[PDB]
Write an enzyme that holds these catalytic residues in place. Sequence first.
Site, PDB file in Angstrom:
ATOM      1  N   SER A 130       0.859  -1.193   0.000  1.00  8.64           N
ATOM      2  CA  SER A 130       0.000   0.000   0.000  1.00  8.64           C
ATOM      3  C   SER A 130       0.891   1.238   0.000  1.00  8.64           C
ATOM      4  CB  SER A 130      -1.007  -0.109   1.138  1.00  8.64           C
ATOM      5  OG  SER A 130      -2.089   0.768   0.911  1.00  8.64           O
ATOM      6  N   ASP A 176      -9.098  -4.584  -5.719  1.00  4.64           N
ATOM      7  CA  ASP A 176      -8.670  -3.638  -4.698  1.00  4.64           C
ATOM      8  C   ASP A 176      -9.503  -2.365  -4.790  1.00  4.64           C
ATOM      9  OD1 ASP A 176      -7.163  -1.956  -3.047  1.00  4.64           O
ATOM     10  OD2 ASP A 176      -5.296  -2.949  -3.646  1.00  4.64           O
ATOM     11  N   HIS A 208      -7.387  -5.649  -1.247  1.00  3.52           N
ATOM     12  CA  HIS A 208      -6.206  -4.920  -0.801  1.00  3.52           C
ATOM     13  C   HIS A 208      -5.419  -5.681   0.255  1.00  3.52           C
ATOM     14  CE1 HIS A 208      -3.822  -1.322  -0.510  1.00  3.52           C
ATOM     15  NE2 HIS A 208      -4.010  -1.234   0.795  1.00  3.52           N
TER      16      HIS A 208
END
Length: 264
Positions: A130, A176, A208
């Site tokens: 991320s 995601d 995600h």
Amino acid sequence: ANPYERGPDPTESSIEAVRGPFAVAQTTVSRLQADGFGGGTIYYPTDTSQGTFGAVAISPGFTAGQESIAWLGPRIASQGFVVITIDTITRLDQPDSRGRQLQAALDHLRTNSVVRNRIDPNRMAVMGHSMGGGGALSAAANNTSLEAAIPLQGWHTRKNWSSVRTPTLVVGAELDTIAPVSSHSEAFYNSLPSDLDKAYMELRGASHTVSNTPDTTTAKYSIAWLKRFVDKDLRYEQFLCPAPDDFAISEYRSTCPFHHHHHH
Ligand SMILES: *[C@@H]1O[C@H](CO)[C@@H](O[C@@H]2O[C@H](CO)[C@@H](O)[C@H](O)[C@H]2NC(C)=O)[C@H](O)[C@H]1NC(C)=O
């Protein structure tokens, strides 16, 4: 002969293994001991008889601790790498800051009393999840000497990575909603230079959080990428070129075959 080859000749089985051929030990870096990052855990091979190993730093994402990427530490290190999984100075640090902290963590290894003589200080890589993956790209853009970069569901406001000269594997998650591939991962891949050794791997059906618990596809191709580029280990190109056949990959793009520089 490639002086950086470590471990036995690989197979799909060996790169999918939860524990690789090298026994590993670990040591903790406190915040007090960490200049420019939030501390971390270093995983390293105990066997020194094959020589030194490349080093890898791994960052978590926004609001996340080291625990969210910790499983990658021993799984990668046991393939023949010194790997530090970091905490950031705060969990609200932004992507470029995470890139600086990844670089600071790599620099720490150069004088860490436990692993300084186990690393090759000139063969280093960055990874992250991320915003930590945004940090990996940022660190590579800021340090063309890095040998590999692997953003996992990376998140960054900066979409243009044309200045990156580090071989980069971009791992997206198809479904995601936090770092959607269309505006993050895929955009990053598209703006990396065409002459770069690079690949984009989209994980079918994945959200995600796919990187926050063990995912064999993520591990096996991160290992193959680090081997191919941190170690220049051509034995691992077979897994990246041609496109992998794993069901867990819904899309694969790359600049295969990758560049092999030689003095022949
Ligand atoms: C690229 O790396 C340099 C060197 O670490 C970073 O520049 C430092 O940035 C911090 C805070 O951002 C400043 O306090 C330092 O004074 C800077 N040092 C120098 C020598 O300029 C730079 O920020 C990094 N770039 C990115 C985008 O993160």
